[PDB]
Amino acid sequence: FGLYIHNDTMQALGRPQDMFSDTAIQLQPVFAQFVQNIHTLAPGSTAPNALEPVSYAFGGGVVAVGGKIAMMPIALGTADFMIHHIHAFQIHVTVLILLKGFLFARNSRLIPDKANLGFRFPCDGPGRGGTCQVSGWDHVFLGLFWMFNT
Amino acid sequence: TKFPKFSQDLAQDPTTRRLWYGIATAHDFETHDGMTEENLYQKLFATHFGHVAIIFLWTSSLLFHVAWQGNFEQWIKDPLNVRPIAHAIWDPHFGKAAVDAFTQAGATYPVNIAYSGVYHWWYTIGMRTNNDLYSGAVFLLILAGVFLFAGWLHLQPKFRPSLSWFKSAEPRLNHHLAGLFGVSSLAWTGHLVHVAIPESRGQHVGWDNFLTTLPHPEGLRPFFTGNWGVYAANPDTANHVFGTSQGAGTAILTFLGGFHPQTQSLWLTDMAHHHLAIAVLFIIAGHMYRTNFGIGHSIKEMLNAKNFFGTKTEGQFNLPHQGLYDTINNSLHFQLSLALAALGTITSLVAQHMYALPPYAFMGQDFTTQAALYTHHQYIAVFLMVGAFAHAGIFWVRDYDAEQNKGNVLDRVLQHKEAIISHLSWVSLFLGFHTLGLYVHNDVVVAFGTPEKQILIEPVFAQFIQASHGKVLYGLNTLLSNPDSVASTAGAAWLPGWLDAINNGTNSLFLTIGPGDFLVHHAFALGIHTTVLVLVKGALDARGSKLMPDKKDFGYAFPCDGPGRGGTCDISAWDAFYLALFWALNTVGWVTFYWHWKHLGIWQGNVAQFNESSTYLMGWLRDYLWLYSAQLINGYNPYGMNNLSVWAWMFLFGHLVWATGFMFLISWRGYWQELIETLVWAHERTPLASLVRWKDKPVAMSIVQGRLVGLAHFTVGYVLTYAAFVIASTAGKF
Amino acid sequence: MFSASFLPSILVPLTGLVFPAIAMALLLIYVEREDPSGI
Amino acid sequence: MSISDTQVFVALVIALIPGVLAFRLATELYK
Ligand SMILES: CC1=C(C/C=C(\C)CCC[C@H](C)CCC[C@H](C)CCCC(C)C)C(=O)c2ccccc2C1=O
Ligand code: SF4
Ligand code: SF4
């Protein structure tokens, strides 16, 4: 995200050469391209008794009908990178919240009575400062917010 | 107690023999005073490290030196004629025509010719310039140094491996047989397709351009689709020239088979496909045993299987095998003997798969190089095996427990050794008697003027196997001489080229034979038969004899057992080793001269002399003994010199040390001491020189040391002269 | 000669003669050492 | 082609790393 807003600032700052697409500073997801490629020429050798590729977004001809597209190969340039990476980002934080509630369900480093007390309860008084939202389903609250974003 | 410290005993004697015995034990570790197992194991670890380090240093030595003052590129331009360069020459004592008969290949300094043949192999690997091998030296040098330091590290306390870490085998097994060369041959294959084949086809691929250019234009297509015939694209043409592109090709893995019509060597693509095969084959062979993880074959308990399908067993193949698998892990002489025997065998095989399957270019035309290499490797091989038998013998005294092997297969061998040695003596006597009788038959019959009254045998079993491999010369129409049999549609999938090659028996590919080959091959049989005879006799007497059973406790040592019955000298368990060494030297001489005469007659095609004078031994010592030496004998003489004087000096030096050997062998230590007495008497009583005294009181030599020095002199005398003769003859006759 | 310097002219004698000399001298004085130290 | 003072160089890489490294690996075992 900070990379994203960096490029944002650069575009707003009359420094367009500091952008990150093909026409500027480079980065290219070669792995997806190569896997799609090795998928393109699959039939004949890997699939002898097979006529056309499995789909046409990887490779093949642009299949259509009328003045209306059915399927064409999809292009992965530069913008794919940060999009997939922020996908992974949010999935990571989601797992973080949920698994955190999972492990720290029965005993925390401060609350040793959680499972001794329940999993649906608001708080444990203003001890240690505050303790509100120390159950688990509030963890899943935050998690469902995050998965909404995702 | 200082010298020798490793034995407090030997430093308690004021006789010069101390020094003599001081330097004949420093590499017998387990005999030093006070060192248990793990000490020995760890220092053996380190010392083996040092050995491979100095091997690397040696390689760097030769390679840097040829990089310095050689003509490798001048050998690139005119390969089949330009001669390689060994190194520079520097001796003030030198002659006159030396500088006058040395400076060639455009050089102005006294160059030294090279014979080992690293140029051909290296260019085959695809080198072009001096800087290549310059950097090569520079970096394997640092490799050697780092390896040395690695050896040093494990000497520190916190880096001391465990004895159990040494006993556990299966990890070493898998790691070696899969991850030592399988992956390494994979890496070599990568170097082949990335560098070697391009340089063969004339394209230069350095250390930077290799990152962007491809092995094949169809590259990465069969990578993950499975049409591997695509990489078997258009092969190289019938006119291609290495290092050029005239009729080039764009095929990576081919199976052409036979030879390449220009280098008459193995095809490089066949080599790559071969290496790939064995690599993946060893990898699938890698996971074959059981590790610390919980699957596989438990070696020390696989053969601990004494039951299957009701009928239990006596073992695998129904023979006892229980209790010895710890020994291979207990002793070291056992593994050492196995390794030595294996190595010697495959070295002989190597020496045999060279003069028919040229691996590198220009190999066949340059006779002197390949000839020297062949006899070199075979000589290396012969007493390499004797090492195996000797260490087997010494294992039999040190590393052996009785009850642990009660009734297993070893004891059942020992129980009937007698018939073995008896029948072996029998076959030796038979073959010797009859071969000598047939020889002398020929000699007398030809010694009367009538040769038709003389026997000629004719071998046909080798003839049958020759045609049966696919030779047509004899026209028997069997098994690829019969182009219609059941197996006549099989073999290589590129057997046409192989057939063109083998039919073209013009090269060294299974040449015809006659009666002589029958004779000498039976001679070889005899030779190895008596050799193994004496060796196994010494081995199976490593414990004791009928008329001297105690020797098991006397040791693999001197014991003489003075004249009980007529004498008992030479009973000491490697007395046999001397005899075996003689019996091996004469055998290897026989065989290498046979090879030499064969290929010499093949050189100019005049096979008439061999077949004509192979029967009676007069012909042997007349046709090839002195009919090639005047080309060498007059290298120097009262009239002039040549570039061979040093080789005549080789001859004569060898003869001298040879006779010195006889001197040491015949006279014994009962005469060389009386005169040392009177010769000590002198210094005591002459004036103006009685000032000085003795560092140490001198005495005569020892017996075993006398035997050893005599044998050493004999062997060194034998080695030199024959080498000089062979290379001088090959380079003087072509 | 070639592109290298004089070195192959005189670097053999010291390796040929003097280094063996010191080698054997040090060795001989080593094989007579006192007790219990030695270098 | 051939070389220059760079051979004095390749001599200089020796006598510190390999030289005294081998010296130590020798003297470890108590002359
Ligand atoms: C000659 C001989 C001797 C006598 C051999 C002796 C005394 C050894 C020879 C003395 C030394 C080895 C001579 C070498 C001296 C060198 C000249 C000194 C070396 C110094 C240089 C390196 C500078 C025996 O003791 C013997 C014992 C049993 C069987 C046969 C024989 C036998 O044949
Ligand atoms: S910490 Fe806040 S939410 Fe929790 S009990 Fe106290 S006042 Fe209520
Ligand atoms: S050589 Fe002498 S000491 Fe040795 S066994 Fe024979 S007689 Fe006895």
3-state secondary structure A102-124: HHCCCCCCCCCCCCCCCCCCCCC
**Cβ neighbours for A94, distance < 8 A, ≥ 6 positions apart:** A143, A146, A147, A150
Ligand-binding annotation for A49, yes or no, is yes
Helix (H) or strand (E) run with residue B63 in it: helix B37-69
Task: Find tokens 């000032």 and name the residue.
Answer: B691
What is the rounded distance in angstroms from the CA atom of residue B514 to the CA atom of residue B499?
Answer: 24
Task: Find tokens 């197996």 and name the residue.
Answer: B487
The percent helix, strand, coil of chain C (3-state, each to 5) is: 50, 0, 50
List the one residue out of B256, B248, B47, B56 whose CA is nearest residue B151. B47
Question: Does B562 sit in the ligand 3 pocket, CB within 6 Å?
Answer: yes
Interfacial D residues in 2-31 facing C (CB < 8 Å): 2-4, 7, 31
The CB density around residue B26, as the number of other CB atoms within 10 Å, is 11
The binding-site residues of ligand 1, defined as CB within 6 angstroms of any ligand atom, are B 663-664, 667-669, 672, 700-701, 706
Residues for chain D: how many in total?
31
Kindly determine whether residue C2 and residue B69, on different chains, have CB atoms separated by under 8 Å: yes
What is the rounded distance in angstroms from the CA atom of residue A96 to the CA atom of residue A139?
Answer: 10
Facing residue for D7 by CB, picked from C4, C38, C39: C4
Structure obtained using? cryo-EM
**Cβ neighbours for B393, distance < 8 A, ≥ 6 positions apart:** B535, B538, B539, B542, B556, B573, B574, B576, B577
- Minimum CA distance residue for ligand 3 atom 6: B569
CA distance D30 to chain C (A): 10
Kindly determine whether residue B46 and residue D25, on different chains, have CB atoms separated by under 8 Å: yes
**Would residue A69 be called left, alpha or beta, if left means φ above 0 and alpha means ψ between -120 and 50 degrees?**
beta
D6: nearest CA in chain B? B134
Facing residue for D4 by CB, picked from C3, C30, C39: C3
- Minimum CA distance residue for ligand 3 atom 8: B562
The CB density around residue D18, as the number of other CB atoms within 10 Å, is 19
Task: Find tokens 């500027």 and name the residue.
Answer: A24
What is the rounded distance in angstroms from the CA atom of residue B455 to the CA atom of residue C31?
Answer: 68
- The single-letter code of the amino acid at B195 is V
Q: Pairing state of beta strands A68-71 and A63-65?
A: antiparallel
- For the record, the structure tokens of B665 come out as 């062998």
Give A22's Cβ-side CA count (13 Å radius): 5
Contact list in B for residue C2 (CB cut-off 8 A) is 69, 109
Alpha helices, H only, C1-39: 12-13, 19-30
Which ligand sits closest to the CA of A124? 2
What is the rounded distance in angstroms from the CA atom of residue B276 to the CA atom of residue B222?
Answer: 16
Question: Does A133 sit in the ligand 2 pocket, CB within 6 Å?
Answer: no
* Full DSSP string of B349-387: HHHHSSSSS--STTTTT-HHHHHHHHHHHHHHHHHHHHH
* Full DSSP string of B518-582: HHHHHHHHHHHHHHHHHHHHHHHTSS-BTTB-THHHH-SS----TTSSS---S-SSSHHHHHHHH
Question: Does B34 sit in the ligand 3 pocket, CB within 6 Å?
Answer: no
Task: Find tokens 């062949």 and name the residue.
Answer: B374
The separation between CA B643 and the C-alpha centre of its own chain, rounded to angstroms, equals 30
Which ligand sits closest to the CA of A126? 2
Q: Backbone breaks in chain C (C–N > 2.5 Å) follow which residues?
A: none
Kindly determine whether residue B88 and residue C33, on different chains, have CB atoms separated by under 8 Å: no
D1 close to C (CB below 8 A): yes
Q: How far is the CA of B19 from the centre of ligand 1 (A)?
A: 13
- For the record, the structure tokens of B243 come out as 């290092």
List the one residue out of A56, A61, A87, A86 whose CA is nearest residue A74. A56
Which long-range CB contacts under 8 A does B21-30 form with residues at least 24 apart?
A: B21/B702, B24/B705
Kindly determine whether residue B68 and residue D17, on different chains, have CB atoms separated by under 8 Å: no
Residue A129 burial (CB < 10 Å; 0-12/13-18/19+)? exposed
DSSP state of B194: I
Residues for chain B: how many in total?
734
Q: How far is the CA of A134 from the centre of ligand 2 (A)?
A: 11
**Cross-strand partners of D8:** none
Task: Find tokens 């108590």 and name the residue.
Answer: D30
Residue B607 CA: distances (Å) to CA of B430, B586, B601, B614, B628: 31, 25, 5, 11, 16
- Minimum CA distance residue for ligand 1 atom 5: B701
Kindly determine whether residue A45 and residue B223, on different chains, have CB atoms separated by under 8 Å: no
Q: How far is the CA of B717 from the centre of ligand 3 (A)?
A: 28
List the one residue out of B426, B706, B708, B668 whose CA is nearest residue B577. B708
Question: Does B560 sit in the ligand 3 pocket, CB within 6 Å?
Answer: yes
Q: Which atom of ligand 2 is nearest to the CA of A123?
A: 4
Question: Does B670 sit in the ligand 3 pocket, CB within 6 Å?
Answer: no
C30: nearest CA in chain D? D31
* Full DSSP string of B453-507: GS------HHHHHHHHHT--TT----SSSSTTSTTTT-SSS-HHHHHHHHH-TTS
Three-state DSSP class for residue B181: coil
Which residues from B are below 8 Å from D when comparing CB atoms? 5, 43, 46, 50, 57, 64, 68, 130, 134, 137-138, 141-142, 144-145, 148-149, 151-152, 155
Task: Find tokens 């090709």 and name the residue.
Answer: B249
Which long-range CB contacts under 8 A does A25-28 form with residues at least 24 apart?
A: A26/A78, A27/A78, A27/A81, A28/A77, A28/A78, A28/A81
Kindly determine whether residue B224 and residue A46, on different chains, have CB atoms separated by under 8 Å: yes
The separation between CA B163 and the C-alpha centre of its own chain, rounded to angstroms, equals 33
CA distance B43 to chain D (A): 9
- For the record, the structure tokens of A101 come out as 């509630």
Q: Judge contact between B357 and B267, C-beta under 8 A.
A: no
Q: Judge contact between B552 and B544, C-beta under 8 A.
A: yes
DSSP state of B452: G
Sign of CA dihedral B519, B522, B527, B530: negative
- For the record, the structure tokens of B49 come out as 């490290």
Q: How far is the CA of B670 from the centre of ligand 3 (A)?
A: 10
Three-state DSSP class for residue A47: strand
Could you list the residues of B known to form a binding site for chlorophyll a, using ranges. 90-91, 112, 115-116, 121, 188, 191, 207, 352, 453
Kindly determine whether residue D10 and residue B64, on different chains, have CB atoms separated by under 8 Å: yes
Main-chain dihedrals φ then ψ at residue B283, nearest 5 degrees: -65, -50
First to last CA, chain C: 44
- The single-letter code of the amino acid at B103 is T
Subunits with 3+ C-beta pairs closer than 8 A to D: B, C
Angle in degrees, 0-180, between the axes of helices A137-149 and A80-103, rounded to the nearest 10: 170
Alpha helices, H only, chain A: 2-12, 30-40, 80-103, 137-149
The CB density around residue D20, as the number of other CB atoms within 10 Å, is 12
Question: Does B568 sit in the ligand 3 pocket, CB within 6 Å?
Answer: yes
Three-state DSSP class for residue B238: coil
Helix (H) or strand (E) run with residue B498 in it: helix B495-503
Q: How far is the CA of B671 from the centre of ligand 3 (A)?
A: 14
Q: Judge contact between B98 and B113, C-beta under 8 A.
A: no
Main-chain dihedrals φ then ψ at residue B83, nearest 5 degrees: -95, 140
What is the rounded distance in angstroms from the CA atom of residue B470 to the CA atom of residue B483?
Answer: 9
Kindly determine whether residue A46 and residue B221, on different chains, have CB atoms separated by under 8 Å: no
**Cross-strand partners of B31:** none
- For the record, the structure tokens of A107 come out as 């005993």
Task: Find tokens 């509630």 and name the residue.
Answer: A101
- For the record, the structure tokens of B632 come out as 């060498």
Residue B647 burial (CB < 10 Å; 0-12/13-18/19+)? buried
List the one residue out of B265, B171, B154, B248 whose CA is nearest residue B203. B248
The CB density around residue B630, as the number of other CB atoms within 10 Å, is 9
DSSP state of A69: E
CA distance B208 to chain C (A): 29
Kindly determine whether residue A44 and residue B227, on different chains, have CB atoms separated by under 8 Å: yes
Q: Judge contact between B677 and B628, C-beta under 8 A.
A: no
Say what the alpha-carbon torsion angle B692, B697, B699, B703 is, to the nearest 10 degrees.
-140
Residue B83 CA: distances (Å) to CA of B75, B78, B119, B466: 7, 9, 10, 37
The separation between CA A5 and the C-alpha centre of its own chain, rounded to angstroms, equals 18
- The single-letter code of the amino acid at B451 is P
Q: Judge contact between B428 and B530, C-beta under 8 A.
A: yes
Three-state DSSP class for residue B641: strand
What is the rounded distance in angstroms from the CA atom of residue D24 to the CA atom of residue D31?
Answer: 12
**Cβ neighbours for A86, distance < 8 A, ≥ 6 positions apart:** A1
List the one residue out of B271, B268, B275, B270 whose CA is nearest residue B182. B275
* Full DSSP string of B571-624: -SSSHHHHHHHHHHHHHHHHHHHHHHHHHHHHHSS-THHHHHSSSSHHHHHHHS
Sign of CA dihedral B395, B398, B401, B402: positive
DSSP state of B279: H
Chain B with chain D: Cβ pairs closer than 8 A: 37
* Full DSSP string of B286-300: GGGS--TTS-S--HH
- Minimum CA distance residue for ligand 1 atom 33: B664
* Full DSSP string of B301-339: HHS-----SSS--SSGGG---TT-HHHHHH-SHHHHHHH
Kindly determine whether residue D3 and residue C4, on different chains, have CB atoms separated by under 8 Å: yes
Task: Find tokens 């389903």 and name the residue.
Answer: A137
Subunits with 3+ C-beta pairs closer than 8 A to B: A, C, D
- Our answer on whether D and C touch (3+ beta-carbon pairs < 8 Å) is yes
Contact list in C for residue D29 (CB cut-off 8 A) is none
Q: Which atom of ligand 2 is nearest to the CA of A133?
A: 4
What is the rounded distance in angstroms from the CA atom of residue D28 to the CA atom of residue B556?
Answer: 31
